[PDB]
Amino acid sequence: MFFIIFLAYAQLAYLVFGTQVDDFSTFQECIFTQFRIILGDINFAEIEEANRVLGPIYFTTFVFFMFFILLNMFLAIINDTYSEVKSDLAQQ
Amino acid sequence: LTYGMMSSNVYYYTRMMSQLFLDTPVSKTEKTNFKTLSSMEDFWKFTEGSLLDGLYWKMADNRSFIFYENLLLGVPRIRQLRVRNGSCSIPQDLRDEIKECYDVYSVSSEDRAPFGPRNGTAWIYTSEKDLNGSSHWGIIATYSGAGYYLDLSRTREETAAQVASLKKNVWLDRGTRATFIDFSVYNANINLFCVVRLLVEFPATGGVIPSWQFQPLKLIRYVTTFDFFLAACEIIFCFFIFYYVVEEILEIRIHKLHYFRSFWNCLDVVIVVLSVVAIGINIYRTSNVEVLLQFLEDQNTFPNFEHLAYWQIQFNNIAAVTVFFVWIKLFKFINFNRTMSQLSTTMSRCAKDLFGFAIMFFIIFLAYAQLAYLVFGTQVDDFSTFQECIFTQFRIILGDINFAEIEEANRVLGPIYFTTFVFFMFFILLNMFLAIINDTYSEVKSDLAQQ
Amino acid sequence: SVLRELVTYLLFLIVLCILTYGMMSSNVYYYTRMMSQLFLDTPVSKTEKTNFKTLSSMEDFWKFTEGSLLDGLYWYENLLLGVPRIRQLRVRNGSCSIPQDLRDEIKECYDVYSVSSEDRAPFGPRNGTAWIYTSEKDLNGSSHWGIIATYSGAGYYLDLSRTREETAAQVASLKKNVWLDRGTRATFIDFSVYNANINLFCVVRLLVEFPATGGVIPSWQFQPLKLIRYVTTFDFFLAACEIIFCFFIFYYVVEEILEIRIHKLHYFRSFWNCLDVVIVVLSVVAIGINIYRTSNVEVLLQFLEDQNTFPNFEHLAYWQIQFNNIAAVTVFFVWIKLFKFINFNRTMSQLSTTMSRCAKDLFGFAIMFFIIFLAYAQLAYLVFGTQVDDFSTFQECIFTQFRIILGDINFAEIEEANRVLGPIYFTTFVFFMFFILLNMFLAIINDTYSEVKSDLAQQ
Amino acid sequence: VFPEPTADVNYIVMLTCAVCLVTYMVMAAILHKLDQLDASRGRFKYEILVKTGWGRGSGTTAHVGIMLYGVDSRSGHRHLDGDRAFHRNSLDIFRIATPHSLGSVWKIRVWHDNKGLSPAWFLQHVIVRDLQTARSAFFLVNDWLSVETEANGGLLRFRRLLVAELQRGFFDKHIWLSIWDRPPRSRFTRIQRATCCVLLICLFLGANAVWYGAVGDSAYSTGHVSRLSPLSVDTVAVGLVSSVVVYPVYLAILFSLAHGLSLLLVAVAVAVSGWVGASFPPGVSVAWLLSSSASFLASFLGWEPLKVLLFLAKEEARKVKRLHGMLRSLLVYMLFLLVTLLASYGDASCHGHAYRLQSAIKQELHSRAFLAITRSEELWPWMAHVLLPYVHGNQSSPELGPPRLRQVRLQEALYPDPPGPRVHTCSAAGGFSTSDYDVGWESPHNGSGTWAYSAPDLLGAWSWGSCAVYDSGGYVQELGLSLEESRDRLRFLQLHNWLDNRSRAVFLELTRYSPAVGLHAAVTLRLEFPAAGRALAALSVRPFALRRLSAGLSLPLLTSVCLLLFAVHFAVAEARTWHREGRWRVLRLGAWARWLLVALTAATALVRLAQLGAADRQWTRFVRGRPRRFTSFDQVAQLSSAARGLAASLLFLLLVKAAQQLRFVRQWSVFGKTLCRALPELLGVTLGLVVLGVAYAQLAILLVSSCVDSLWSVAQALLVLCPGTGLSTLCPAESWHLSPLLCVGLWALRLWGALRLGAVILRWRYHALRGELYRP
Ligand SMILES: CCCCCCCC/C=C/CCCCCCCC(=O)O[C@H](COC(=O)CCCCCCCCCCCCCCC)COP(=O)(O)OC[C@@H](O)CO
Ligand SMILES: *[C@@H]1O[C@H](CO)[C@@H](O)[C@H](O)[C@H]1NC(C)=O
Ligand SMILES: *[C@@H]1O[C@H](CO)[C@@H](O)[C@H](O)[C@H]1NC(C)=O
Ligand SMILES: *[C@@H]1O[C@H](CO)[C@@H](O)[C@H](O)[C@H]1NC(C)=O
Ligand SMILES: *[C@@H]1O[C@H](CO)[C@@H](O)[C@H](O)[C@H]1NC(C)=O
Ligand SMILES: *[C@H]1O[C@H](CO)[C@@H](O)[C@H](O)[C@H]1NC(C)=O
Ligand SMILES: [Ca+2]
16 A cells, blocks of 8 residues: 555656656656655755645645654554564463 | 656656755855855846856857756746835934835835836836736745746856846845846756746845755656556546546435535545546646647747646646545545444544634634744744744744754743643643543443444 | 852853863864865876875875875975884685576685685785784784774785885885775875974874775875974963863762762762763863873974884774764754753742653653664665665664754655655655654653642642 | 735735634634623622511412612512412512622612512511611511502602613623623623624624725725824715714614624625725825724714613522633734734735845856855956946836945955865954045055055944954945946056955845835855865745835734734733732742733834834935945845734744634543643653753764775664755755754654653543543
8 A cells, every 4th residue: 555655646746747857857866866755865945946836735635644643653553463462472 | 657757767757957056056165055045146146156157068059958958948038026226214203315216016116117227128128918928926926927037048148148248237236125036947868847936035124035846847758658648647646547537426416415413525525526627727738738738839039837837836736635534535445344343433522622722722822922023023034924923833843943043043031932832742731631531442342342 | 058159150150261262273183184185186187186195096095106196295285103004904716606597607706805805815925014914913903994894903014115216116116016905995004294384293004995896995094183382372371271280170979979978878860960971071072182182292302303113093083083072962962051050030949840850751751762763773774775875874864854854854865766656755754844743752752741830829 | 896806815805804704703713602691690799687577468379589680780680489389378588599799889770570469568668778788778668559650769850850760771782792781681692782782893894995906996996095193084084984984784684583684794895805905006095094993983883872872509609700710811812803803914925025135136146156165366367257237237126225345354364275175164364443545455545545454434334244244344335327436446456456365254235125026135155265276055035024114004013013012901910910929829820921911012012113214214314315325124024024923923823822722612521631730740841851951962973974985884874864965965064053962862762652651641531531521
């Protein structure tokens, strides 16, 4: 699911910024740029000027969905699995 | 369709022109370029300097190939928009030391009278209809398609003389509000036009604001077999959209009259609406190309290609959003085992609580944003507009911020803002989402296991 | 009964804090920075744009030693503490085996620097001590641990003069009668300055390494030191603080000795005793370094008036660096030690029990995390080892990965070095560290917390 | 007349319409909840016997009640049914569930019910003496009359025919005080009243906007709207005519599913308010609000009162009391929010123009030339090269006063610093000696020379200098006669060295004004120098709108006085509770938060009034003689700025309060409960985090400030820093500020995990709160 959403966002970014920003020149470059956005290693001074509308929307929605939804879901899965396995192992 | 619409690298096509016209210093001894213009004299230096160097290249009245490959089409055009004198209202207290005053740009305050040496079209107002122009939506305001315009020549010697004459007789006063430069190139190697527009804004408070636009176009599509393949694929896409809308109408007709409580029907109707809008835009755009024929009838006039570029940008945005939503629609089918079913159930069950908490999260976010706008909004320029404040906060979340630039804007209440925002964003608001998601996932998994 | 412990620890902590604040604003960083800018930033000559930080050939070094070095040394306006020394370490001809396949066009080879392949024969005009090998013992030096190798203290040395018109002549004579042959491997320059305007002694060492593959590599170190004396009342206040600190550490060590004498059978199960002994040993080694430095600081002023002798003052600089490094971790541990008092309430007790009951699981998972970390580091070393310079050595790979964890990526050199398997490495590392592995830590803690609260109910 | 050819927007009308719509939405939700609660069920009441067996012959199914037409509670008669259900020859003796409260006055009335057979029994009364409040009498007429003939009494004449009726419908047909004072089971739904109320207020707003925007020239043309101050004939005579002029249309719906279409009409109402109000001068938009308020007050006092001339029960009671209190609090908070919004965002266009103006001023003086200065001798050609054309050239046509110049070295000449480097920050200073002087140097010829000391003035004592700061002390210059005398004066100053010698700062600041935007600005440059030659740099441009206290009744004055009224109301309300409880009003948010709110509300108005007065005084001083002095407007440019910040802070608080009020949704009430319950563990973890952050911060800065790129190999990679700066550029020897330390500590805490620990706590608490409020 995570990579389906990631590739949808990457394709949108490729179609929007693919001729002006040089960080979205190719699809693989879009993927690498999206991975670098998580670390906070992007300009955003070129994203906003390449497209004033639909440029900031992409960035804000991507940040909100990656940081506040998917990472928390990974953490929840890991926490629940660890607690369940430890409890059942101790019980048995 | 998407992979065909992004052909071989037109990114380099755009980049070469951008570097030629934007990164080149206006002259040899100074280091300012178009991106760092700071005064009207710098604009005049640019017009007679790097602009003419980039526009005209050497191989009787021969044409100009910009990189020995890109053919300059017709002649470039320059235009300006200005306001009337005495269009503001100064107080009677200072009505002796201040005589003249010009307001900000607006159609109510714009000038329409001849000025200076009234000789030709450069000193006479021309209406928008008689100029076949339209609005632009610049950075400061939205400028009309009218103004005072001049058409340059096909050779450097005549254009230089024209620009020198425009500079001698003062054509840029302090009443000037905006200036546009427009032209186009072809580059027959790959069949793809390029439209170039450069805008320079002169705000009423002084200073200069530059902006640019380089837009590739395709107007002679059917040249190769791949073009016919793309046309056939477009026809197939139209048939698919027709079938989908027919199926949607059948499913909304009688069966499940409500039909809106699925979140998949809403996605389907959104996709259909976007697709039909894109199809209509494409049909209205490709069938209106009389500008190209008029230019080809006589190739010594300005080629009017801005409407095509505007509609191409609109179509690109619509297509990108449609593709994104079509790809998102794939979640309707990934339920092939018990692992994905419980994940989808968890998401669907926790969405209703995530929305309720996101309301509070966004209220607090907007409170912080408005505080930052009101405090740092006149000195930082990362907070100069409300949406810029929102984007700046989203960047602060990622750590892409310069704390020193807001610490010096306000010695106190700046560090307070930064510290409180970071603390309450990473220690409270981020963890409540995790709490909700973890509780819902645990409840769903335990319910399934017990049942 | 813990009130006395809390109050004595509070007095110890405030004493340490005031000592730190006294060391906080010594204003030695700014002087060293703008004196480094005097040597490493000014163009080598009026025409060339290069500096010591960007040396690239033998000629650049030869221009540096006649130019930016001389004019910035004989004129802020500091005065010399003697005569600077310049030393050279070289290897011998025929120190490696030329393959027989292609040896009719190559006649001599020079191996990388090593004690086995070091040269000792008198080369060039055998006039003085700059053309004859002198052992380490006569030079009273030690190893340097440079960038590409570690260098002995021996070599071919020459002491310059206190007058510019003679030092320039000496270095010109060295340049004329060729001194830097193909066998040269390293060059050291050492001196010291005073800068009477603000009382701060400084020792300066510059090193130029000549690899066997050609080129040069520059490195530098400027170290400040002080000759503190009772000249005001504030320095007396800090002196009283130092005596108070000595009394406090003696108090802590004697009662630690008592508490270990009464319970010598078991003393390592508790965690705070280990922290206390670490604190006391760090404090005692730091104070020993300080007393040695203040005892030996009385010999450096002998060269201030007039002395045509080179002062070897590198041990003081090394031990001062060690003293700063020790002081930092000392205050950190004496900031951690504060954590054993705040355990007054029931909630604090639950938090402390949660943290104490999950130490073994965290340590166990650290092993797996480090195994995966070393696997990734070895992969990065094998892939980007010869291209990026953030992965040139194994420790550099380790530190680069640590910086990547904290968000300090470059990704330009990584992508350029390997268009495939570079981005794969980056993406896989980011995905598996920011979404899977680092979460597991928290998971452990999370469970423990719940368990703790649960037993409260059963209690 | 078709107005609005322009494109600027007026924020007052939009803000007030948004506030009214939002308060209507909240009231509609809460009132619908209350209506459904009341309809699900649809003092004066005593616990005494009602055995009225004084007669017989009236055997029939009868169930009547009483009407306690008293003070603040006048309910009608009710009915009840028992086992026998009032069979033949049976007298009912029981008490009914009546929540109306009467008083110890002549307020009693009992109804009857004669269904079928006529009444023959004589039911005297219910003998009650003292049960709850003794609001009844144990005596009556006890007579028989026609069918449904209710006996009158105290505890048909025209003078008393329907005067009692004026105590039933008085708060029923008065649409304002009828949303919480209606009788049970009425055909009004209690939200139709809110619908017609919001329609009425929006229609007042629309009528006032239309009159002030379009129909204002037929009666008196050539700009009749030119007075804003209340002269008892203006801004009042417009409200009543409007008021009345739509009153009838409001009636038209008061007479029914037209409400579903009525919300449409209200829409287009604000539409004209969003259209005709865009071209409103500031003086007109501050009278439009006053006229609307006057019209509403007239309707509340003059026209509506004239129109009227023509167990579980305790739980429900406390619920309805709580809901009424919530309505009152909602209205008060909405009014406070509207006042704060008007105080904050009245001139956002001026905000954007001010930012652009300051940027243009900075870029037009070569700010990065002044920032990168290291020679005290190139300052004079810098001033003679870019500053003189700026001040005297045709570029800055509006200047508003001649420039000025001054500095501080005190009485001690500087010394030649070492070439290249300089003193640490400002070493080898002087002090500050005040005394007269003459041309060339401090050496009087016959008396007090022209080169005076220029001592501090009455107001403006703030410069916030890095090393030292004065108010006005310095060698004041004139720089007049823009033609040629400026260069001559500069050359004379350079030659005579009257102020060149013994200098440690620059402190140059003249003026700025933008006639188009309508904003002034104060630009000041500081070049504090440790000694001769090397110097630091700093620039500060502050734009502001020059509005004066004598200008009239501008929006800031009205907002400030309303804020002061709100502050005093909150203060007295909190003092009433404080005096009720005496002392020991501690250990709760309560008073400790209300006091801070009152302090903020008082300061955000006091600072505004102070800046208005300071601006007026400075403007008068400047107008006295304009081409003689400097007048130092900078002080005003500070105060206004401060005021703005205060306002923002206030709004911020109010906004977060809105989030706290979202708990009223039952399914969304767990987040606030979770936070409130987990607060102690969060505080403990916060204490631990603070200790760890302090330790790490002072380890990191100690490691950093001990070397020049020669720290370590391990610690060079594990050391986090404040975002926005690198590792090479740190350790400023001028001052070790606390804010970089806080940033470093907090960001290091955030990057090393150490902030997901809250997720360990909150999650648990969240789980614990979903077993104690969803399970049972
Ligand atoms: C034989 C005896 C054995 C001795 C005991 C053995 C102990 C062995 C150490 C294990 C390290 C434990 C913490 C290391 C965690 C490092 C990474 C981390 O914190 O992960 C977070 C959860 O972790 C966590 O909250 C874990 C707990 C957080 C606490 C962080 C403090 C770090 C170290 C404090 C030093 C104190 C004392 C030091 C000297 C005594 C989740 O990623 P998060 O989204 O949040 O952002 C990260 C993103 O921004 C960049 O990575
Ligand atoms: C602008 O108009 C004013 C009168 O309103 C006049 O004094 C001034 O000279 C005019 N400026 C021009 C024509 O440039
Ligand atoms: C106007 O046009 C005439 C003829 O085309 C030319 O001679 C003159 O220089 C132009 N400019 C003026 C009169 O300012
Ligand atoms: C180094 O030794 C080899 C031994 O074969 C000799 O041929 C060569 O000439 C020597 N190098 C020089 C510079 O003499
Ligand atoms: C080495 O020889 C003499 C030492 O007696 C010295 O003066 C000279 O400068 C040196 N160099 C030569 C002779 O090339
Ligand atoms: C080092 O000290 C020794 C003392 O034995 C001295 O002989 C020697 O000259 C010193 N260094 C030098 C110049 O070799
Ligand atoms: Ca469907």
